[PDB]
Structure 1
Amino acid sequence: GPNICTTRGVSSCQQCLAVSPMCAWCSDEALPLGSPRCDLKENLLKDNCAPESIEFPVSEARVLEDRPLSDKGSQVTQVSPQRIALRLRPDDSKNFSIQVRQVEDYPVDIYYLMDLSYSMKDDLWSIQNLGTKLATQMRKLTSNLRIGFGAFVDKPVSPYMYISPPEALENPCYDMKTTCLPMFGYKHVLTLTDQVTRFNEEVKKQSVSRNRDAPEGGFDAIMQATVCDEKIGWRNDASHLLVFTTDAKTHIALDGRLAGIVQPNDGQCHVGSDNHYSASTTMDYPSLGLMTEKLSQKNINLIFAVTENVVNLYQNYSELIPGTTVGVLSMDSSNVLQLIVDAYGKIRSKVELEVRDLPEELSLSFNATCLNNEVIPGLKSCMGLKIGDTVSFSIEAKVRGCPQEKEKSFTIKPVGFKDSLIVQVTFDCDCACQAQAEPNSHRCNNGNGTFECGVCRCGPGWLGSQCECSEEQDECSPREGQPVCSQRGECLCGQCVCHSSDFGKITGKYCECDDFSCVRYKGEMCSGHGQCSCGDCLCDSDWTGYYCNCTTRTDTCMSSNGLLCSGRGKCECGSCVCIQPGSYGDTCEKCPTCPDACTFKKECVECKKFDRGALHDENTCNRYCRDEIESVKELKDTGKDAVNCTYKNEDDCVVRFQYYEDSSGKSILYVVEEPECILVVLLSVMGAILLIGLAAL
Structure 2
Amino acid sequence: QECTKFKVSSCRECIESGPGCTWCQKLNFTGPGDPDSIRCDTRPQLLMRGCAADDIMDPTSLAETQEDQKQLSPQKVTLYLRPGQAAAFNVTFRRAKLSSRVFLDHNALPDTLKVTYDSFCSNGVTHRNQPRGDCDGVQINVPITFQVKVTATECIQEQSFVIRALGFTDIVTVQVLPQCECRCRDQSRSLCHGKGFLECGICRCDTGYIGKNCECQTQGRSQELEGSCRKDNNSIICSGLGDCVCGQCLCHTSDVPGKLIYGQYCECDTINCERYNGQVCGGPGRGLCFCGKCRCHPGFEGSACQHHHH
Instruction: Normalising by structure 2, report the TM-score.
Output: 0.58
Q: Between Structure 1 and Structure 2, which shows a larger proportion of helix residues?
A: 1
Q: Is the Cα contact below 8 Å between 1:99 and 1:391 reproduced in 2?
A: yes
Partners of 2:205 and 2:173 in 1: CA distance: 45
Q: Which residue of 2 aligns with 1:398?
A: 151
Gap change, CA 1:358 and 1:437, over 3 Å in 2 = farther
Gap change, CA 1:28 and 1:373, over 3 Å in 2 = farther
Partners of 1:395 and 1:460 in 2: CA distance: 43
Gap change, CA 1:439 and 1:402, over 3 Å in 2 = farther
Q: Which residue of 1 aligns with 2:170?
A: 419
Gap change, CA 1:18 and 1:470, over 3 Å in 2 = closer
SS of alignment partner, residue 14 of structure 1: helix
Bigger Cα displacement from structure 2, 459-468 vs 386-395: 459-468
Match of 1:364 among 100, 112, 115: 115
Q: Which residue of 2 aligns with 1:64?
A: 66
Q: CA deviation at 1:351?
A: 0.4
Q: Which residue of 1 aligns with 2:23?
A: 25
Q: Is the Cα contact below 8 Å between 2:63 and 2:87 reproduced in 1?
A: yes
Partners of 1:463 and 1:19 in 2: CA distance: 22
Partners of 1:461 and 1:85 in 2: CA distance: 39
Q: Which residue of 2 aligns with 1:102?
A: 95
Per-residue CA deviations over 1:48-76 (Å, capped at 9, x if unaligned) read: 3344433221111122229xxxxxxxxx6
Match of 1:87 among 76, 80, 89: 80
Q: Which residue of 2 aligns with 1:8?
A: 6
Gap change, CA 1:30 and 1:395, over 3 Å in 2 = same
Match of 1:450 among 193, 196, 219: 196
Query: Structure 1 unaligned runs (5+)?
Result: 67-75, 105-344, 475-479, 481-491, 494-697
Partners of 1:392 and 1:472 in 2: CA distance: 61
Q: Is the Cα contact below 8 Å between 2:105 and 2:164 reproduced in 1?
A: yes
Q: Is the Cα contact below 8 Å between 1:61 and 1:96 reproduced in 2?
A: yes
Partners of 1:421 and 1:463 in 2: CA distance: 47
Gap change, CA 1:390 and 1:87, over 3 Å in 2 = same
Alignment of 1:27-176 (within 5 A): 27-33=25-31, 34=34, 36-65=38-67, 77-104=70-97
SS of alignment partner, residue 196 of structure 2: coil
Q: Which residue of 1 aligns with 2:101?
A: 350
Q: Which residue of 2 aligns with 1:650?
A: none
Partners of 2:133 and 2:40 in 1: CA distance: 38
Partners of 1:25 and 1:464 in 2: CA distance: 19
Q: Which has the larger radius of gyration?
A: 1
User: How many corresponding residue pairs?
Assistant: 218
Q: Is the Cα contact below 8 Å between 1:81 and 1:99 reproduced in 2?
A: yes
Q: CA deviation at 1:350?
A: 0.2
Per-residue CA deviations over 1:53-101 (Å, capped at 9, x if unaligned) read: 33221111122229xxxxxxxxx62222332221111343121221212
Which amino acid is the alignment partner of residue 163 of structure 2?
A: I
Identical-pair percentage: 30
1:383 and 2:136 correspond: yes
Gap change, CA 1:437 and 1:363, over 3 Å in 2 = farther
Q: Between Structure 1 and Structure 2, which shows a larger proportion of strand residues?
A: 2
Gap change, CA 1:457 and 1:59, over 3 Å in 2 = closer
Q: Is the Cα contact below 8 Å between 2:63 and 2:77 reproduced in 1?
A: yes
Instruction: Normalising by structure 1, report the TM-score.
Output: 0.28
Query: Structure 2 unaligned runs (5+)?
Result: 217-221, 228-232, 234-245, 248-310
Gap change, CA 1:428 and 1:437, over 3 Å in 2 = farther
Gap change, CA 1:409 and 1:464, over 3 Å in 2 = closer
Partners of 1:96 and 1:53 in 2: CA distance: 29
Q: Is the Cα contact below 8 Å between 1:464 and 1:470 reproduced in 2?
A: no
Partners of 1:436 and 1:359 in 2: CA distance: 35
Alignment of 1:272-671 (within 5 A): 348-356=99-107, 358=109, 361-377=112-128, 378=130, 379-403=132-156, 405-406=157-158, 408-433=159-184, 436=186, 438=188, 443=191, 447=193, 449-453=195-199, 454-456=201-203, 467=215, 470=223, 472-473=225-226
Q: Which residue of 2 aligns with 1:326?
A: none
Q: Is the Cα contact below 8 Å between 1:349 and 1:387 reproduced in 2?
A: no
SS of alignment partner, residue 13 of structure 2: helix
Partners of 1:46 and 1:383 in 2: CA distance: 51
Q: Which residue of 2 aligns with 1:173?
A: none
The structure with higher relative contact order (CA 8 Å, sep 6+) is 2
Q: Which residue of 1 aligns with 2:307?
A: none
Per-residue CA deviations over 1:487-520 (Å, capped at 9, x if unaligned) read: xxxxx95xxxxxxxxxxxxxxxxxxxxxxxxxxx
Which amino acid is the alignment partner of residue 61 of structure 2?
A: S
Q: Which residue of 1 aligns with 2:294?
A: none
Gap change, CA 1:459 and 1:98, over 3 Å in 2 = closer
Gap change, CA 1:21 and 1:385, over 3 Å in 2 = same
Q: Is the Cα contact below 8 Å between 1:351 and 1:414 reproduced in 2?
A: yes
Q: CA deviation at 1:393?
A: 1.6
Which amino acid is the alignment partner of residue 422 of structure 1?
A: T
Partners of 1:93 and 1:60 in 2: CA distance: 8
Per-residue CA deviations over 1:516-546 (Å, capped at 9, x if unaligned) read: xxxxxxxxxxxxxxxxxxxxxxxxxxxxxxx
Partners of 1:16 and 1:100 in 2: CA distance: 39
Partners of 2:215 and 2:110 in 1: CA distance: 42
Partners of 1:436 and 1:464 in 2: CA distance: 19
Gap change, CA 1:385 and 1:472, over 3 Å in 2 = closer
Q: Is the Cα contact below 8 Å between 2:62 and 2:81 reproduced in 1?
A: yes
Gap change, CA 1:360 and 1:463, over 3 Å in 2 = closer
Gap change, CA 1:61 and 1:470, over 3 Å in 2 = closer
Alignment of 1:229-244 (within 5 A): none
Partners of 1:449 and 1:10 in 2: CA distance: 20
Per-residue CA deviations over 1:466-489 (Å, capped at 9, x if unaligned) read: 646747446xxxxx9xxxxxxxxx
Partners of 1:472 and 1:9 in 2: CA distance: 19
Gap change, CA 1:81 and 1:44, over 3 Å in 2 = farther
Per-residue CA deviations over 1:256-281 (Å, capped at 9, x if unaligned) read: xxxxxxxxxxxxxxxxxxxxxxxxxx
Partners of 2:25 and 2:108 in 1: CA distance: 38
